[PDB]
Design a protein around this nucleic acid. Structure first.
Ligand code: HPA
Ligand code: HPA
Lengths: 338, 338
DNA sequence: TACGCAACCGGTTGCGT
DNA sequence: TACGCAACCGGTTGCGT
């Protein structure tokens, strides 16, 4: 079709090309003609052809987990903005924590020749690590580790442990000693990590959390529901609960209300994520905020670099959690005694 | 690189090709050799090269609006599943209801030569319609119209008016006559449409909704908040509210709680969308459910068809809304008098 | 000066033998 | 029998003049 233009224009394709990508000087007349031709023929230049030639697709792939989940959803929306803004095309791929799906997506991606890769796999078993190395040649940055698990990628780290610690503290400082926790999957940073930071703060305070008080979530509202329930369903129940993520949080609020328990009057609840609607949870949720957007652009940035500045050495950027006080927490019984 | 394989294998590339795409018979030995070569060289065949040749990218583009919003998020997640499953690669593009962004994305898309296009633009001004026609050559289906606005595309229709009518009815049948509404943007189907179905049911019942009782939302929690507030902030207030979408709903629940109003004891509220967490809103939200997934796969399906079966005639499939009874509605004052 | 030639990127596939 | 030749898809870009 580029020939078709050149022909109408009575110039070479080489010419047509250059004008289109202003990559060398072209006489005005000449320029105009090509533009005209380009217009009547309704010419869209093939990017595949161009990619074939130039050796880069100008498109980047997101090998995610799930994309509906608030947390995830927010990051992705961010990522895209960034790609758009710097002319990159986004390939969204959800592997659902399934190795096969993951080997699958990884391969189409490579074949489609993505310029770089954004990785959000949630859980990372050896096998997954292994596959990843297999594609060390394609530039990449993992956005979900707590510390860097491999030398062949960039990493952005979130300080999930310092956010976890922040949560317990707040609780401690507000009057609490009988507290419960509903963590997310231990095979995850946001899971394991947040829990540990949260547990440290407790040891520091000589607060022991009885095992019947710790109930595993999976980040979904239902787990929030089940757990909150199992927690208060007991003879002896805490006065405060630390919940691994805002959505499960929102689930624990339901159940409490359903048991007829008052928040935060009967139980205070602290969240984690500061998701876009957390303020509209009822009551407005006090949670720890995770810089999602920065989490996004920061990853993009490291990627681009590696891409354009062809960096070869793995980098790792840290980002920081921060408390957001809302209305779901209340003074504990020990407030005045501090 | 295909040459590189052929060379190790001591066969022609033609050969190497065929074996890889089992597109003609190959002696076992021969086959093995190529596979071996393919292996040591760690060969990933270029899809761009192949696309260049075969004339199709095997990738489809989603020209969306926003992707974080529950509603949207859910559809997209669906769409992807479908693409994956039939070997298509997804290009997510959010135009944010901005013409430019939209002309922009539309063009990269064409240049990237997407096999087909999924369109979710929310509002459709002439200019936007116009651009769309400009690309009638690329197969497409709009997923968000109420009725079909153009002959050059497929459409999936949701019956937003029958869902709107369903909502009012329920209210009517539960005892209500003083009702309010917070609709979404009138420039949208889900906006305008739902409101009209809702308004019809009312005329039928000789129920007039006073203008101070109708407050525009924008589908976001905050509008839900502001409106619910402006509604109850009045001398005279309804006994029930119909809210255009679940999230804004979730916003109206906040405010009511914040004004110290009880749901549904002081005000019943009916939603619309049946979003994945609506059951966990507090109280669990009674809403009208929109088949999001079907809404998704159905679109994919029409697309593929047009793609593979090269259909030329615009098609249009209808999908159906349905009531979901939860805990946010209560008997109105006129229940017993029916 | 302002522009054109022809090889190249990496595969597919119709004819042959 | 089982496989190879060479043109083609649609652009880019080093040498020239
Ligand atoms: O893995 C996760 N899933 C959903 N929400 C989350 N928030 C933090 N981590 C996660
Ligand atoms: O345009 C919309 N935006 C967000 N949620 C929605 N639910 C229906 N339509 C919409």
């Amino acid at each position: 079709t580029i020939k078709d233009v050149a022909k109408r224009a009575n110039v070479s394709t080489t010419t047509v090309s250059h004008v289109i990508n202003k990559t060398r000087f072209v006489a005005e007349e000449t320029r105009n003609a090509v533009w005209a031709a380009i217009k009547e023929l309704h010419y869209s230049p093939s990017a595949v052809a161009r990619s074939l030639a130039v050796n880069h697709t100008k498109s980047i792939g997101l090998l995610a987990t799930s994309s509906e989940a608030a947390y995830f959803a927010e990051i992705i929306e961010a990522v895209e903005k960034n790609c758009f803004q710097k002319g990159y095309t986004l390939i969204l791929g959800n592997a659902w924590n399934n190795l096969e799906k993951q080997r699958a997506y990884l391969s189409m991606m490579a074949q489609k020749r993505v310029d770089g890769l954004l990785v959000m796999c949630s859980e990372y078993p050896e096998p997954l690590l292994a596959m990843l190395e297999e594609y060390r040649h394609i530039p990449m940055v993992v956005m979900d580790w707590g510390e860097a698990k491999a030398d062949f990628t960039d990493a952005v780290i979130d300080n999930a442990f310092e956010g976890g610690y922040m949560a317990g503290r707040y609780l401690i400082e507000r009057g609490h000693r009988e507290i419960g926790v509903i963590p997310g999957p231990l095979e995850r940073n946001t899971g394991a990590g947040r829990l540990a930071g949260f547990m440290k703060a407790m040891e520091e305070a000589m607060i022991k959390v009885p095992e019947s008080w710790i109930v595993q979530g999976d980040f979904e509202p239902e787990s929030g529901y089940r757990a909150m329930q199992q927690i208060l369903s007991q003879p002896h129940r805490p006065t405060a609960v630390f919940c691994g993520g805002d959505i499960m949080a929102m689930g624990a609020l339901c159940a409490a209300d359903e048991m007829g328990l008052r928040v935060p009057q009967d139980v205070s609840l602290i969240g984690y994520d500061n998701v876009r609607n957390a303020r509209y949870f009822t009551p407005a949720l006090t949670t720890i905020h995770q810089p999602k957007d920065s989490l996004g652009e920061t990853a993009f940035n490291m990627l681009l670099d590696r891409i354009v500045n062809k960096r070869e050495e793995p980098q790792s950027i840290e980002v920081h959690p921060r408390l957001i006080e809302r209305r779901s927490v209340a003074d504990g019984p020990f407030r005045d005694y501090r």
